Amino acid sequence: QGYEEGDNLLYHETSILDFVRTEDPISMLGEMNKFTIDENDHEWKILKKLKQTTDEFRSCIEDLKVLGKKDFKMILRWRKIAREILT
């Protein structure tokens, strides 16, 4: 059905913080390719010392359109934990 007018590279990346803070994550996960990581950001410095941040979370985050629904649900759980931390 064609391509977007404002989309040149057909590449959509946002911030893991933007994912954490957005209210509707379903459409974002549908229309994102990657979640970039900043190691000089204090929120990410906080979230680096968590149980689910390490292991295969980074590999599942570096790409999105190869993931399965189980990987996506794990990502949703990680964002949920990050949200909870945030007379």
Partner 1 sequence: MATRTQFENSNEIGVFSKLTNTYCLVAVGGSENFYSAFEAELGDAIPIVHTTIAGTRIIGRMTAGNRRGLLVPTQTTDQELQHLRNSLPDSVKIQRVEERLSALGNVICCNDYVALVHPDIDRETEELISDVLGVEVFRQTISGNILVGSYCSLSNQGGLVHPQTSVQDQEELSSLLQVPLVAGTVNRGSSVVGAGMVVNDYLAVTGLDTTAPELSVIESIFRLQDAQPESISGNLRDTLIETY
Partner 2 sequence: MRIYQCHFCSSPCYPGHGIMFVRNDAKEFRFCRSKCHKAFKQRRNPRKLKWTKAFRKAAGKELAVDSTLTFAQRRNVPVRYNRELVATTLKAMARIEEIR
Partner 3 sequence: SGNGAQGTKFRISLGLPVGAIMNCADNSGARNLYIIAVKGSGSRLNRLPAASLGDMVMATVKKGKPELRKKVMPAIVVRQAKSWRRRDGVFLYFEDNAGVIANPKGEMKGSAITGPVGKECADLWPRVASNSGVVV
CB count within 10 Å of CB 48 equals 12
Among 31, 38, 56, 62, binds partner 2 (CB under 8 A): 56
Nearer residue to partner 2 within complex by CB, 43 or 71: 71
In the chain, after which residues does the backbone break, taking C–N over 2.5 angstroms as a break?
86
Quick check: 33 binds partner 2 (CB under 8 A)?
yes
Residue 36 DSSP SS3 = strand
Nearer residue to partner 3 within complex by CB, 21 or 34: 34
Quick check: 59 binds partner 2 (CB under 8 A)?
yes
The secondary structure of the chain in percent helix, strand, coil, rounded to multiples of 5, reads 45, 5, 45
Nearer residue to partner 2 within complex by CB, 49 or 70: 70
Quick check: 2 binds partner 3 (CB under 8 A)?
yes
